[PDB]
């Protein structure tokens, strides 16, 4: 059987709920102790086991407060998750890529033993909002050893991500006027290889700031993607293939994917 499975068999309601089946704890990461990023919060399951680990970045002028709900929710499904602050709130995407990587390595090596003992350091993922989503793409290109990448309403001036092989779910917002899907999220998705595991999910009725307030669709598909690719958990394939692929009014404007997904 797959040794990385955690939690009960999933349902729609379980994934749409405010929290998953794991109670969570928090560890503050001081700015002074945070090496190579601005600090942040680590959310982790109280139950002693090993889990995959995830770092999440905000965007320009943003703080961890704009992503905290999502890091806590993902951790409650069985992940160790750090929501970062950046060195300055104005850092550019390629700098945020570095900082996401530094945050992964902080969790693995420099957090409390309570946190470090809960991490499988071989199973890592990154996510981020807007310029933090651009940073997610850049880090994925640098680190094909990541198990998953989830850019949220991403922003980057580089439109060509044709080397990336990390399983990548891009979440766009139909009404985004700041990182429009026409010039950011869709070109990024279209440039990813056809031969990798990838998906594009466009939220319906959503602005650029949809990732900054609790969202049941972002939570559902972020957790299903992380389960499928960080944990190789094929109990979550059913949510992603074929996925919400004809739209779902007020939920999903469009969904594209390279289903079926190769299994590691
Ligand atoms: Cl941004
Ligand atoms: Cl917007
Ligand atoms: Cl399929
Ligand atoms: Mg702090
Ligand atoms: Mg729409």
User: What CATH number did the domain enclosing 88 receive?
Assistant: 3.40.50.1820
Q: Is 200 marked as a binding-site residue?
A: no
Structural domain harbouring 262? 1-264
Technique that determined the structure? X-ray
Evaluate the omega torsion of the peptide bond into residue 242 and state whether it is cis, within 30 degrees of 0.
yes
Catalytic hit among 156, 184, 208, 233 = 208
d(CA 246, CA 70): 26
Q: Which ligand is the nearest neighbour of the Cα of 237?
A: 3
Enumerate residues 6+ apart whose C-beta is below 8 A from 242: 257, 259
Residue burial 141-154, b: 16+ Cβ < 10 Å; e: rest: bbbeebbbbbbbbb
3-state secondary structure 42-95: EEEECCCCCEEEEEEECCCCCCHHHCHHHHHHHHCCCCEEEEECCCCCCCCHHH
Residue 131 marked in a binding site = yes
Catalytic (active site) residue 176 = yes
Token readout for 85 is 């602050």
Between CA 150 and CA 72 the distance in angstroms is: 16
* Residue tagged active-site, from 176, 197, 231, 233: 176
Q: Which residues surround ligand 2, an ion (CB under 5 A)?
A: 176-177, 207-208
Within 80-215, where are the H helices? 93-109, 113-116, 131-142, 185-191
For residue 175, what is the enclosing H or E element? none
Active site residue 156: no
- Distance, CA 63 to ligand 4 centroid (Å)? 11
**Quick check: 69 and 63 in contact, CB under 8 A?**
no
Sheet holding 119-129, edge to edge: 24-29, 40-45, 80-84, 51-57, 119-129, 148-152, 168-173, 198-203, 252-257
On whether 60 is known to bind a ligand per the annotation, the reply is: yes
End-to-end CA distance of the chain: 13
**Domain total of the chain:** 1
Tell me how far CA of residue 25 lies from CA of 50, 56, 79, 111, 114, in angstroms.
15, 17, 11, 13, 10
CA 205 to ligand 1 centroid distance, Å? 20
**Distance of alpha carbon 157 from the chain centroid:** 20
Resolution in angstroms comes to 1.5
Q: Which ligand is nearest to the CA of 262?
A: 3
How many whole angstroms from 215 Cα to the centroid of ligand 5?
16
∠183-208-212 over CA atoms, to 5°? 140
> Other CB atoms closer than 10 Å to residue 176's CB: what's the count?
24
3-state class of 216 per DSSP? Answer: helix
How far apart are the CA of 240 and the centre of ligand 4, in A?
35
Tell me how far the alpha carbon of residue 105 lies from the centroid of ligand 4, in angstroms: 17
Which ligand lies nearest to the CA atom of residue 176 in the structure?
Answer: 2
Q: Which phi and psi angles does 81 have, rounded to 5°?
A: -130, 130
Q: Which residue in the list 130, 197, 222, 257 is annotated as catalytic?
A: 130
Helix (H, G, I), strand (E, B) or coil at 152: strand
């Amino acid at each position: 059987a797959n040794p990385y499975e955690r939690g009960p068999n999933p349902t729609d309601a379980l994934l749409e709920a405010s929290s998953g089946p794991f109670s969570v704890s928090e560890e503050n990461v001081s700015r002074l102790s945070a090496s190579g990023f601005g600090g942040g919060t680590i959310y982790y399951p109280r139950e002693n086991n090993t889990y995959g680990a995830v770092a999440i970045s905000p965007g320009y002028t943003g703080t961890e407060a704009s992503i905290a709900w999502l890091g806590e929710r993902i951790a409650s499904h069985g992940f160790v998750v750090i929501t970062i602050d950046t060195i300055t709130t104005l850092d550019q995407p390629d700098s945020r890529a570095e900082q996401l990587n530094a945050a992964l390595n902080h969790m693995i090596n420099r957090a409390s033993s309570t946190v470090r003992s809960r991490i499988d350091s071989s199973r890592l993922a990154v996510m981020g909002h807007s310029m933090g989503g651009g940073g997610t793409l850049r880090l994925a290109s640098q680190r094909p050893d990541l198990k998953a990448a989830i850019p949220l309403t991403p922003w980057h001036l580089n439109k060509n991500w044709s080397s990336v092989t990390v399983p990548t779910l891009i979440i766009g917002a139909d009404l985004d006027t700041i990182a429009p899907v026409a010039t950011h999220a869709k070109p990024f998705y279209n440039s990813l290889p056809s031969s990798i595991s990838k998906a594009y999910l466009e939220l319906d009725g959503a602005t650029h700031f949809a990732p900054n307030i609790p969202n049941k669709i972002i939570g559902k598909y972020s957790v299903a993607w992380l389960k499928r690719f960080v944990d190789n958990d094929t109990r979550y394939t059913q949510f992603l293939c074929p996925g919400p692929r004809d739209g779902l009014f007020g939920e999903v404007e469009e969904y594209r994917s390279t289903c079926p997904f190769a299994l590691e």
